[PDB]
Design an enzyme around this catalytic site. Structure first.
Site, PDB file in Angstrom:
ATOM      1  N   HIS A  79       0.822  -1.214   0.000  1.00 53.77           N
ATOM      2  CA  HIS A  79       0.000   0.000   0.000  1.00 53.77           C
ATOM      3  C   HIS A  79       0.854   1.262   0.000  1.00 53.77           C
ATOM      4  O   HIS A  79       0.523   2.236  -0.683  1.00 53.77           O
ATOM      5  CB  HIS A  79      -0.958   0.004   1.195  1.00 53.77           C
ATOM      6  N   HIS A 238      -9.405  -1.763  -4.805  1.00 55.01           N
ATOM      7  CA  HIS A 238      -8.277  -2.027  -3.922  1.00 55.01           C
ATOM      8  C   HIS A 238      -7.307  -3.019  -4.554  1.00 55.01           C
ATOM      9  O   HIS A 238      -6.089  -2.888  -4.384  1.00 55.01           O
ATOM     10  CB  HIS A 238      -8.709  -2.543  -2.550  1.00 55.01           C
ATOM     11  N   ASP A 242      -3.365  -2.579  -4.984  1.00 54.80           N
ATOM     12  CA  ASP A 242      -2.344  -3.578  -4.665  1.00 54.80           C
ATOM     13  C   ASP A 242      -1.450  -3.843  -5.867  1.00 54.80           C
ATOM     14  O   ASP A 242      -0.230  -3.996  -5.729  1.00 54.80           O
ATOM     15  CB  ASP A 242      -2.997  -4.901  -4.257  1.00 54.80           C
ATOM     16  N   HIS A 265      -0.664 -11.123  -4.665  1.00 51.42           N
ATOM     17  CA  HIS A 265       0.735 -10.737  -4.508  1.00 51.42           C
ATOM     18  C   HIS A 265       1.673 -11.795  -5.063  1.00 51.42           C
ATOM     19  O   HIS A 265       2.689 -11.460  -5.684  1.00 51.42           O
ATOM     20  CB  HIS A 265       1.046 -10.470  -3.041  1.00 51.42           C
TER      21      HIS A 265
HETATM   22  C1  LIG Z   1      -6.640  -8.156  -0.446  1.00 49.86           C
HETATM   23  C2  LIG Z   1      -5.559  -8.265   0.619  1.00 49.86           C
HETATM   24  C3  LIG Z   1      -6.223  -8.370   1.992  1.00 49.86           C
HETATM   25  C4  LIG Z   1      -5.297  -8.227   3.205  1.00 49.86           C
HETATM   26  N1  LIG Z   1      -6.185  -8.442   4.333  1.00 49.86           N
HETATM   27  C5  LIG Z   1      -7.005  -7.305   4.802  1.00 49.86           C
HETATM   28  C6  LIG Z   1      -7.968  -7.500   5.960  1.00 49.86           C
HETATM   29  C7  LIG Z   1      -8.071  -8.835   6.612  1.00 49.86           C
HETATM   30  C8  LIG Z   1      -9.056  -9.020   7.770  1.00 49.86           C
HETATM   31  C9  LIG Z   1      -9.824 -10.172   7.792  1.00 49.86           C
HETATM   32  C10 LIG Z   1     -10.739 -10.368   8.813  1.00 49.86           C
HETATM   33  C11 LIG Z   1     -10.880  -9.413   9.803  1.00 49.86           C
HETATM   34  O1  LIG Z   1     -11.813  -9.639  10.828  1.00 49.86           O
HETATM   35  C12 LIG Z   1     -11.783  -8.732  11.896  1.00 49.86           C
HETATM   36  C13 LIG Z   1     -12.986  -9.076  12.782  1.00 49.86           C
HETATM   37  C14 LIG Z   1     -13.836  -8.077  13.231  1.00 49.86           C
HETATM   38  C15 LIG Z   1     -14.920  -8.405  14.029  1.00 49.86           C
HETATM   39  C16 LIG Z   1     -15.154  -9.729  14.377  1.00 49.86           C
HETATM   40  C17 LIG Z   1     -14.302 -10.727  13.927  1.00 49.86           C
HETATM   41  C18 LIG Z   1     -13.219 -10.399  13.126  1.00 49.86           C
HETATM   42  C19 LIG Z   1     -10.114  -8.254   9.778  1.00 49.86           C
HETATM   43  C20 LIG Z   1      -9.197  -8.053   8.752  1.00 49.86           C
HETATM   44  F1  LIG Z   1      -8.439  -6.917   8.720  1.00 49.86           F
HETATM   45  C21 LIG Z   1      -7.260  -9.986   6.130  1.00 49.86           C
HETATM   46  C22 LIG Z   1      -6.299  -9.784   4.963  1.00 49.86           C
HETATM   47  O2  LIG Z   1      -5.641 -10.684   4.572  1.00 49.86           O
HETATM   48  C23 LIG Z   1      -4.656  -7.037   0.571  1.00 49.86           C
HETATM   49  O3  LIG Z   1      -5.121  -5.949   0.566  1.00 49.86           O
HETATM   50  N2  LIG Z   1      -3.219  -7.175   0.526  1.00 49.86           N
HETATM   51  O4  LIG Z   1      -2.461  -5.997   0.479  1.00 49.86           O
HETATM   52  S1  LIG Z   1      -4.621  -9.784   0.326  1.00 49.86           S
HETATM   53  C24 LIG Z   1      -5.796 -11.162   0.233  1.00 49.86           C
HETATM   54  O5  LIG Z   1      -3.795  -9.704  -0.879  1.00 49.86           O
HETATM   55  O6  LIG Z   1      -3.623  -9.991   1.354  1.00 49.86           O
HETATM   56 CL   LIG Z   2      -1.763 -14.972  -6.454  1.00 53.16          CL
HETATM   57 ZN   LIG Z   3      -3.998  -4.472  -0.213  1.00 48.21          ZN
END
Ligand SMILES: C[C@](CCn1ccc(-c2ccc(OCc3ccccc3)cc2F)cc1=O)(C(=O)NO)S(C)(=O)=O
Ligand SMILES: [Cl-]
Ligand SMILES: [Zn+2]
Ligand SMILES: [Ca+2]
Ligand SMILES: [Ca+2]
Ligand SMILES: [Cl-]
Length: 300
Positions: A79, A238, A242, A265
């Site tokens: 980011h 988003h 990324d 990624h």
């Molecule tokens: C697209 C990607 C995503 C990176 N990301 C961003 C957020 C989360 C996440 C998931 C769950 C959660 O629950 C919180 C909660 C609140 C209330 C009750 C229970 C739980 C809170 C979180 F922040 C996981 C995650 O992996 C990205 O932007 N990368 O830069 S990724 C796939 O590429 O990594």
């Molecule tokens: Cl991938």
């Molecule tokens: Zn991201």
């Protein structure tokens, strides 16, 4: 005038927490000389460990882009690097007091504001661009990431989530960044994740800092955030954010088009690595007249 390399005009500071580690971190952005690139520095270590933000230093790509050197890492660089790319910043030191960039509000919005508050500074060396000369692609199953030639900079992306908050929504977006649309179009698009995953993620030292304060948190049948989306297509925007940040691990602005299909990624890094090896597919170019270049930049 020629298109010149840019760095920061003054030192910029932010505090936050790492999305995945949950750790408090101080972030200090500093000017850097010509041809430095973006270099991360772990200043909690003595002597420091410096990691250039380059594809060759990518280690893991599980739920973030992680840079590695020696025994240590700098996690979740995508980011901040997206903000750097979006603003045309060639050279900077990024000092961190811990192993992960602060997540801020989950977007690049806070970073572009903090940087533009201090301003950029042109340096007396030509800005170098990587121009895509022929198609380069990587696939893994149904996932795909492709570079194609294009006189400008354009990013398209398609996601496909088998999830009731996603089914029946466009999940596709294409943005032309040859002019100055990054800030308006994608900089404020927040990261997102799924509440269902949070126990597994935390067991892997992932999302330990994630909340509705810094991410769109998606439940089984609804978005958990009460305050609402910043864009109706914020999820795919988003993913574009990324992609721009991961692409900036090339070390230079791109002249070409990126298309992502269900990629992330890991595949973005594989695309950069095969591009770098496929030297006939790209060249380095400069512009001695900004008026005949295919990308325009805002005032510093
Ligand atoms: C697209 C990607 C995503 C990176 N990301 C961003 C957020 C989360 C996440 C998931 C769950 C959660 O629950 C919180 C909660 C609140 C209330 C009750 C229970 C739980 C809170 C979180 F922040 C996981 C995650 O992996 C990205 O932007 N990368 O830069 S990724 C796939 O590429 O990594
Ligand atoms: Cl991938
Ligand atoms: Zn991201
Ligand atoms: Ca520490
Ligand atoms: Ca609505
Ligand atoms: Cl570490």
């Amino acid at each position: 005038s020629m298109i010149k390399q840019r760095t920061l005009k003054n030192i910029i500071r932010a505090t936050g927490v790492g999305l995945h580690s949950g750790e408090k971190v101080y972030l200090t952005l500093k000017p850097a000389p010509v041809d430095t690139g973006i270099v991360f520095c772990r200043t909690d270590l003595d002597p420091v460990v410096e990691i250039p933000a380059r594809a060759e230093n990518v280690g893991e790509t599980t739920m973030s882009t992680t840079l590695v050197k020696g025994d240590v890492k700098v996690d979740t660089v995508e980011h901040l690097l997206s903000a750097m790319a979006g603003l045309g910043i060639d050279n900077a030191y990024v000092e961190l007091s811990a192993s992960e960039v602060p997540i801020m509000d989950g977007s690049a919005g806070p970073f572009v504001f903090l940087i533009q508050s201090a301003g950029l500074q042109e340096q007396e060396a030509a800005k170098k661009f990587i121009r895509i000369k022929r198609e380069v692609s990587v696939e893994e199953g149904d996932k795909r990431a492709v570079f194609v030639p294009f006189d400008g900079f354009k990013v398209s992306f398609e996601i496909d989530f088998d999830h009731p908050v996603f089914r029946g929504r466009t999940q596709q977006a294409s943005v032309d960044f040859s002019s100055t649309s990054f800030v308006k179009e994608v900089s404020r698009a927040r990261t997102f994740g799924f509440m269902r995953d949070i126990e597994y993620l935390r067991s892997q030292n992932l999302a330990l800092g994630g909340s509705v304060e810094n991410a769109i948190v998606v439940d089984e049948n609804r978005v958990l955030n009460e305050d609402g989306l910043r864009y109706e297509d914020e999820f795919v925007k988003h993913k574009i954010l990324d992609a721009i940040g991961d692409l900036y691990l090339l070390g230079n602005s791109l002249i070409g088009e990126f298309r992502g299909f269900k990629s992330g990624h890991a595949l973005n890094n594989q695309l950069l690595r095969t591009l770098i090896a496929d030297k006939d597919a790209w060249e380095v170019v400069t512009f001695e007249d900004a008026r005949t270049a295919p990308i325009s930049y805002m005032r510093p």
